[PDB]
Amino acid sequence: PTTTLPGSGQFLTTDDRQSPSALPNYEPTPRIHIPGKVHNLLEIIQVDTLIPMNNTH
Amino acid sequence: PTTTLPGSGQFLTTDDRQSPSALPNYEPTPRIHIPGKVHNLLEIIQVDTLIPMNNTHTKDEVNSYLIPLNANRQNEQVFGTNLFIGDGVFKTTLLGEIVQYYTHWSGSLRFSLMYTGPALSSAKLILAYTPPGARGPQDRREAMLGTHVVWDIGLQSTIVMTIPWTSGVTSAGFLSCWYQTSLILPPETTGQVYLLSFISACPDFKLRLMKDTQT
Amino acid sequence: VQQITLGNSTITTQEAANAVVCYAEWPEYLDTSVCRFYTLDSKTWTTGSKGWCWKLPDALKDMGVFGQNMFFHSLGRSGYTVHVQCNATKFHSGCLLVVVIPEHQLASHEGGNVSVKYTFTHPGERGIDLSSANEVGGPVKDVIYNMNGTLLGNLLIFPHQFINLRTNNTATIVIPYINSVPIDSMTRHNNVSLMVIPIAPLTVPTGATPSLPITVTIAPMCTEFSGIRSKSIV
Amino acid sequence: VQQITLGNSTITTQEAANAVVCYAEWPEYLDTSVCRFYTLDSKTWTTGSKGWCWKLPDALKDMGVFGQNMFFHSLGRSGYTVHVQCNATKFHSGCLLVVVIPEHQLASHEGGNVSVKYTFTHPGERGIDLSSANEVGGPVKDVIYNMNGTLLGNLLIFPHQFINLRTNNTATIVIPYINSVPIDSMTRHNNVSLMVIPIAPLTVPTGATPSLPITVTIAPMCTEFSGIRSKSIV
Amino acid sequence: DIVLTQSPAALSAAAGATVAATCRASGNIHNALAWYQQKAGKSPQLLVYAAAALAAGVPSRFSGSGSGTAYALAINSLAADDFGAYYCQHFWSTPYTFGGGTKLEIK
Amino acid sequence: NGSETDVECFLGRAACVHVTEIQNKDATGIDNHREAKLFNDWKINLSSLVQLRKKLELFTYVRFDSEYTILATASQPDSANYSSNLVVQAMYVPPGAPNPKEWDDYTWQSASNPSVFFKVGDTSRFSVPYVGLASAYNCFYDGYSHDDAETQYGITVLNHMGSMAFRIVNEHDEHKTLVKIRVYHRAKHVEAWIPRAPRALPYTSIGRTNYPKNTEPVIKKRKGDIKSY
Amino acid sequence: NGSETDVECFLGRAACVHVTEIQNKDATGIDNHREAKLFNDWKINLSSLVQLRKKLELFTYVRFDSEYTILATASQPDSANYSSNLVVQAMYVPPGAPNPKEWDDYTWQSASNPSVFFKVGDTSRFSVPYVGLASAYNCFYDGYSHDDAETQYGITVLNHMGSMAFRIVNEHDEHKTLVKIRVYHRAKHVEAWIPRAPRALPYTSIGRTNYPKNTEPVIKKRKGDIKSY
């Protein structure tokens, strides 16, 4: 005994849900340690880059 | 209070789900112990099977499994093949029929030869492994300067050579055999003697991303 | 060792690791009744031989007390110890593949829905001469496709043993009872098929006869039959 | 310090924090074989120079035992220590950006699906002279877009170091092995690309020659190769 | 040595008849036989190798058969180009002796 | 590390074993209910699909529970005025049970034949256990079944997996609706014995190892000699 | 505090990667099954979308499981008499597997290609794992793939994410129905390495860093001099 709510069968694109895998039992290529892993975009804007202040061209 | 998600009422064919039984209360025929139960296809490609390296015929025959050897030939090549195990000599073997069900193999191979000529005959064959990326040798001496076994047919009637771990899917490696010495036949026993070559997989052989052969 | 006596039979043989127990399963109940060596007629491996195929228990259907109990009792259950011995000098070359194929369903030489007749699926002690001509209703005898549409090189997945005349001359394959039922009619259904196939052809020296005998000695072991015909009605 | 001896090579240099270890990851196995200083031909930084670009391991492909083992073995795995030294007086000004770009895929100067030829993606010890004319099949050499469509100011997200001739004259960048595979063919694929780009132009005093040498010294460190060609077949 | 006796010596047939040349050896060739075709003042060309396998550029009219010592070369539905001398050669034991030869003429 | 090579995973995947096509129309003056496609029965035969046959016949014996997913999709290639809302009876006939001869037989209402009633456009799903008579199915049978007479050498009723019969429960409209049914079998709890040689040659019969005559050589020829790499 | 700037959240959101359009009609006398739009295959290419390409190419390597949401909507711009109830096979072709050339090929019933059967108007949803051959995808490849010859410099088969093929399982009606399919990819479990410069110039090729010639300057000019605020 259940009742379907409003918003059933909708696809809200931003609503992250788990899904049935189209390749179960597939063992993907293993993760190696590549250096420079970025977890956060607030890590990489702290790197200073040049400013084009001489826009006069 | 529930909400149906996207992908409701779909049939993803690869999504294994339990189902209502069409014959509940049916007691099936009991399991007896049949020998030879296979849990894994990596169990049965480790069994070595013959290689048709003598592809030179326009028909299939037992002679295609026989690698011919010839007297009074020194520094020639006996056979030579690449080690693509999805094409060529390996396409019809038990390894290469089950490799070509999947997409990526990535393991070590177990390559054997078997000398079936007479017990008094003797020769030295040199069995070169050219790794992938390199060129296969084009004289006996380039074969000796690389990875090889100098296999005395007189002493050792069966040699077993483990091809190194490849991930091979020119490329995949080459494998040739050269006459170190000429074939010495027993007296008034002249003609050709034969080798039988075998391929299997070493137990570190993996196999992944199953695909479908068609016809 | 070299005077293996089983019943009132005795054979002389050689072994160091010669017995090939199929699928590492020794035959066992679910001897001392019909367990003796039955030594078939020796085949002549000439230079143009293609191979021989014996069906079991059909090769032992006229063999004394075993073949008597095979037709007396309906249901039976037997394992085998098959010795294939190809005696030769140290001048012969050539290689036999002695292979045991469970449920070797044969292919007819006419194709389609044409099936192989009972005369040919059950050939007896004679076996199937794979170098002979295809008869009407018989199996296909093309040895490259193993009489079933599967290539000869891939026949080593079955429990096999080579007779390389350079190295040895005997092959012993210890066959268990391989079936999907615990007991079955031995007269209508062949459990295994022994095949003896020359891969490398027989080469003789100059001055030798271009032929060589092959002796097949089948010893049925752990042979059971149904309890009926001696079960009491009271 | 100032007599850094690596193999039978020796260089004289200056450092206080000069080594830029890329992404704070020192190169390490998954020396003492091919680990020596290979000192490339000195480039002439004139007043109208636009920059230079060397591909690694392509810049070291003819360099002795390293370039021998690069073409002998298929697969390899190397990190680098790149010293870029621009010796000058205390009268020169100007600024170099010594940057190391992993997977610097170049842009062709014809656009569309036109790709850059192997002659130009693998230029060797010579490198790519970014101040020269675009040849047929070569990369685009417009330095403002870093030869890949991304602006020159944003090139500091890559592991870089400035050579401000006011302040210093050396740049050391310790490159690890950066790839998505654990080992790869060193002859078809360039891991990193060293670029030496004058941002502030070279100004000489009156009475000085309007040119200044730049020396690139690449020391391959933690260099591994595949176990094949010495793995036994037994 | 293995001596090939190629019987017959010459045949008269029309364009469409069946020609079965035959070679029989002293020793056992083990199917290592090659058949050749030669025209007048032309080089010999290879028709059948390994006693059953048709060579490159050979039509399906030719058919090698036989095993062991006796080997037949059956030619079915002759054409106008298929007249000439036919020679076996075994490739088993060094020397590689030829046969006698079968020539074809028109009735 | 090798979980794709398990026989639970190699043999256990949903393949298309049967595609039939039944029609919704009236039986007024219809003699044959199969030529009219009023219903279709299908003896469940996984060796009808030669891709799954060539994988099952890599083993001598195989024992699996079954899993049938049935997709029925409609089609109206005539004047229709509407797409009808149809219901399909997908009736599993067990081994040894009688098959339908008409679409309005007694067999369709037989309680011992399990049937699934589902809509066209939707999908059915049920599972049948191991309904063999031996302890495993026989991919190959060296002998005869039940008889001392000629019994076709390998044609045995031990491998009977049942039968699927399909009709449309709905009565006719004034237009003909064509329902195409796709049966998807997935072998589950698979276990297999005695690995065999892979079949090189194509098939000519079901339940027989007969290969066609004058076929092509499966071992392919080199572009050079044996020494050519 | 900065959970929107995570690469799990910056790169991990459902974008529209592909919009195709297939038709339901008969193949009677139809030569090309793509010009007729009886089916459409699509090599899965996230760099076809230049908004997601410009975000993925902010990093050198990226490794993510995939997540495809497929929305199929019908359309009948002719005389129709009814809206048909259609079923779409959305078949995922894995890397190294053959693509369909016809809508009634063997590939559609191939068991190793996973396919989703869903209704038009409804939505499909499935997930594909990391199907790359390296330990991450290559947004940029400085070199050649598999060969010592010319291999187009950055065109590599390591970045093959598979293929999606789409057909309508239903047979034809007497009217043509136009199904437009929208594939929505969401990169999940995203992890990224070696942050790169943002691309300033537009694109001319896929898998190539080539920018158009005689393009416009990206650094925009002041309305005054350098001293003007």
User: Which residues of chain D are within 8 Å of residue A52 when distances are taken between CB atoms?
Assistant: 153
Beta-carbon separation of C156 and B60 below 8 A: no
CB atoms within 10 A of CB C105: 27
Of D228, D230, D234, the CB nearest to B162: D234
User: Are the C-beta atoms of C192 and C104 separated by less than 8 Å?
Assistant: yes
Beta-carbon separation of F81 and G85 below 8 A: no
Residue bearing tokens 């709890």: F189
Domain positions in chain F are 1-229
Chains C and D are in contact, defined as 3 or more C-beta pairs closer than 8 angstroms:
no
User: Which residues of chain A are within 8 Å of residue G136 when distances are taken between CB atoms?
Assistant: 34
User: Which of D157, D164, D174, D199 should we substitute to test contact with A (largest number of A Cβ atoms within 10 Å)?
Assistant: D157
Tell how many helices (H) and how many strands (E) occur in chain F.
Answer: 2, 11
Interface of B with F in 153-212 (CB under 8 A): 174, 176, 206-210, 212
Alpha-helix residue ranges (DSSP H) falling in chain G:
7-10, 50-56
- Residues on G contacting D at a C-beta cutoff of 8 Å: 60-61, 134-145, 147-148, 150-155, 158, 194-201, 203-205, 208-213, 218-219
E32 touches B: beta carbon within 8 Å: yes
**DSSP 8-state assignment for residue C188:** T
Rounded Cα distance, E73 and E79, in Å: 16
| Strand D170-175 versus strand D19-21 pairing type | parallel
Beta-carbon separation of B208 and A24 below 8 A: no
Please name each of the domains of chain D with its CATH number: 1-234 (2.60.120.20)
Angle at C33 between CA C30 and CA C36, to 5 degrees: 110
User: Are the C-beta atoms of D157 and A44 separated by less than 8 Å?
Assistant: yes
Q: Using CA coordinates, name the residue in chain D closest to G145.
A: D188
Rounded Cα distance, C100 and C194, in Å: 5
- Nearest-CA distance from G183 to chain D in Å? 26
User: Which residues of chain A are within 8 Å of residue F1 when distances are taken between CB atoms?
Assistant: 27
The b-or-e profile of G13-32 (16+ CB within 10 A means b, else e) is bbbebbebebbbbeeeeeee
User: Which residues of chain F are within 8 Å of residue C180 when distances are taken between CB atoms?
Assistant: 61, 134-138, 158
Residue bearing tokens 């083992």: D69
Rounded Cα distance, D222 and D32, in Å: 9
Q: Using CA coordinates, name the residue in chain B closest to D183.
A: B167
CB atoms within 10 A of CB B199: 25
Structure tokens at B27: 């007691």
Chains B and G are in contact, defined as 3 or more C-beta pairs closer than 8 angstroms:
yes
Query: Torsions phi, psi of G109, nearest 5?
Result: -100, 10
SS3 label, residue D144? helix
- Reading phi first (left if > 0) and then psi (alpha if -120 to 50, else beta), residue E94 is in left
Structure tokens at G28: 């009677």
Rounded Cα distance, F181 and F120, in Å: 9
Rounded Cα distance, B4 and B136, in Å: 61
Beta-carbon separation of D152 and A44 below 8 A: no
Pick the CATH number of E1-107 from 2.60.40.10, 1.20.1630.10, 1.10.3720.10, 1.10.10.10: 2.60.40.10
CB atoms within 10 A of CB F189: 14
Q: Using CA coordinates, name the residue in chain D closest to B108.
A: D233
Beta-carbon separation of G209 and D106 below 8 A: yes
Q: Which chains touch A (3 or more CB pairs under 8 A)?
A: B, D, F, G
Alpha-helix residue ranges (DSSP H) falling in chain C:
64-72, 118-121
Angle at B87 between CA B83 and CA B93, to 5 degrees: 85
CA dihedral B85, B89, B94, B95 (to 10 degrees): -20
The b-or-e profile of E9-38 (16+ CB within 10 A means b, else e) is eebebeeeeebebbbbbebbbbbbbbbbbe
Cβ neighbours of residue F29 closer than 8 Å, sequence gap 6 or more = none
Cβ-based contacts under 8 A for chains B and E: 26
B72 touches E: beta carbon within 8 Å: yes
Handedness of CA D109, D113, D114, D119 (dihedral sign): positive
| Strand E102-105 versus strand E10-12 pairing type | parallel
Q: Using CA coordinates, name the residue in chain B closest to G184.
A: B6
Query: Torsions phi, psi of C107, nearest 5?
Result: -105, 135
Rounded Cα distance, G141 and G153, in Å: 7
C-alpha separations of E48 from E36, E44, E59, G100 in Å: 7, 12, 10, 42
Q: Using CA coordinates, name the residue in chain B closest to D72.
A: B134
Beta-carbon separation of D188 and G211 below 8 A: no
Of A13, A34, A52, the CB nearest to G14: A13
A1 touches B: beta carbon within 8 Å: no
G192 strand-pairing partners? A38, G62
E8 touches C: beta carbon within 8 Å: no
Rounded Cα distance, C171 and C198, in Å: 13
User: Which of A39, A47, A51 should we substitute to test contact with D (largest number of D Cβ atoms within 10 Å)?
Assistant: A47
Rounded Cα distance, B90 and F209, in Å: 23
Q: Using CA coordinates, name the residue in chain B closest to E93.
A: B191
User: Which residues of chain F are within 8 Å of residue C117 when distances are taken between CB atoms?
Assistant: 150
Rounded Cα distance, C139 and C148, in Å: 9
- Nearest-CA distance from G152 to chain D in Å? 6
Sheet holding B37-38, edge to edge: B37-38, F188-195, F59-65, F137-138
Rounded Cα distance, F194 and C99, in Å: 14
CATH number of F1-229: 2.60.120.20
Beta-carbon separation of B214 and G111 below 8 A: no
Structure tokens at G78: 């002719």
Annotate chain B with DSSP letters as a single string.
-B-PPSS-S-EETT------BSSTT--PPPPP--S-EE-BTTTTTTS-EE----TTSSS--GGGGEEEEEBS--S-EEEEEE--TTSGGGTTSHHHHHHTTEEE----EEEEEEE-S-TT-B-EEEEEEEPTTSPPPSSHHHHHHSEEEEEETTT-SEEEEEEPP------S-EEEEEESS-BBPPTT--SEEEEEEEEEE-TT---EEE-----
Beta-carbon separation of F9 and A27 below 8 A: no
Beta-carbon separation of C115 and F152 below 8 A: yes
A11 touches B: beta carbon within 8 Å: yes
Rounded Cα distance, A8 and A3, in Å: 10
User: Which residues of chain F are within 8 Å of residue A25 when distances are taken between CB atoms?
Assistant: 3-4, 6, 9
D233 touches B: beta carbon within 8 Å: yes
Interface of B with C in 72-91 (CB under 8 A): none
G89 strand-pairing partners? G117, G167
Tell how many helices (H) and how many strands (E) occur in chain D.
Answer: 2, 14
Beta-carbon separation of B92 and F219 below 8 A: yes
CB atoms within 10 A of CB G189: 14
CB atoms within 10 A of CB B214: 11
Of C48, C206, C210, the CB nearest to E67: C48
Domain positions in chain B are 1-215
E58 touches B: beta carbon within 8 Å: no
User: Which residues of chain F are within 8 Å of residue B54 when distances are taken between CB atoms?
Assistant: 226
Beta-carbon separation of D157 and A35 below 8 A: no
The widest CA-to-CA distance across chain F, in whole angstroms, is: 73
Of G10, G133, G221, the CB nearest to A55: G221
B32 touches G: beta carbon within 8 Å: no
Resolution, given in Å to one decimal, reads 3.0
Cβ-based contacts under 8 A for chains A and D: 32
Beta-carbon separation of F208 and C115 below 8 A: yes
Domain positions in chain E are 1-107
CATH number of B1-215: 2.60.120.20
Rounded Cα distance, G129 and A22, in Å: 8
